[PDB]
């Protein structure tokens, strides 16, 4: 099973000056939650992007996707492609494309699951963001309520599958 994993704003933005430009500590928990001890495949920018102490994601093997071949990404396993991401020498029940923009479009056809947070937060568009895939009628899915975050932003949280 290959599944995708986001967090956007309303709008779609999921990334932002490098980064990803809200706070929301209930999601990196749920992050958290659904991938340790799985396999999370991740774009090099995405890679860039994780702080020190979060570079290589503690407890789930790392897969970097770059076409620079001899990308230094201590921690992690470089690839050539998303395909050669999805077929590990070492199979995984548990596949997660965890980021950026440009993984989760290529990633998309090949997966049956997305599991979306969505955060209550105003964020027109910029330039350079990075935005989220868009789910067609070839996904069908299910949403949690509305939560309170303890900082005040509120999120809720969907979970699609391949019709
Ligand atoms: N909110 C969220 O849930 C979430 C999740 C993840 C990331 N983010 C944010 O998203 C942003 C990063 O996303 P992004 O779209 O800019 O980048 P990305 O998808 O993480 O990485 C893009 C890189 O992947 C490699 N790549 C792309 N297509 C490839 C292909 N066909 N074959 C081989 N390598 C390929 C290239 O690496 P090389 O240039 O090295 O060749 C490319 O520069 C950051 O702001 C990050 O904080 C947000
Ligand atoms: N639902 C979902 N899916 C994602 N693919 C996703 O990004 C995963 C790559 C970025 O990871 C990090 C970035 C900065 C610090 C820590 C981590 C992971 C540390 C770990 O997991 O140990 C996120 C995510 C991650 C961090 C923060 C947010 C925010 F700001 F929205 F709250 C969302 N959330
Ligand atoms: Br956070």
Request: charged share 20%.
């Amino acid at each position: 099973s290959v599944g995708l994993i986001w967090a956007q704003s309303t709008s779609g933005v999921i990334g932002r000056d490098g980064g990803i430009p809200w706070r929301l500590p209930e999601d990196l928990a749920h992050f958290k939650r659904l991938t340790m001890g799985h396999t999370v495949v991740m774009g090099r920018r995405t890679w860039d992007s994780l702080p020190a102490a979060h570079r290589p994601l503690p407890g789930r093997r790392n897969v970097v996707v770059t076409r620079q071949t001899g990308l230094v990404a201590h921690g992690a396993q470089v690839v050539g492609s998303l395909e050669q991401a999805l077929s590990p020498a070492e199979p995984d029940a548990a596949t997660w494309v965890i980021g950026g923009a440009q993984i989760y479009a290529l990633a998309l056809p090949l997966a049956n699951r997305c599991e979306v947070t969505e955060v209550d937060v105003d964020l027109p568009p910029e330039d350079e963001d990075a935005l989220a895939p868009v789910l067609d009628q070839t996904w069908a899915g299910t949403s949690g309520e509305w939560l309170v975050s303890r900082s005040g932003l509120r999120y809720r949280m969907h979970s699609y599958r391949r019709l």
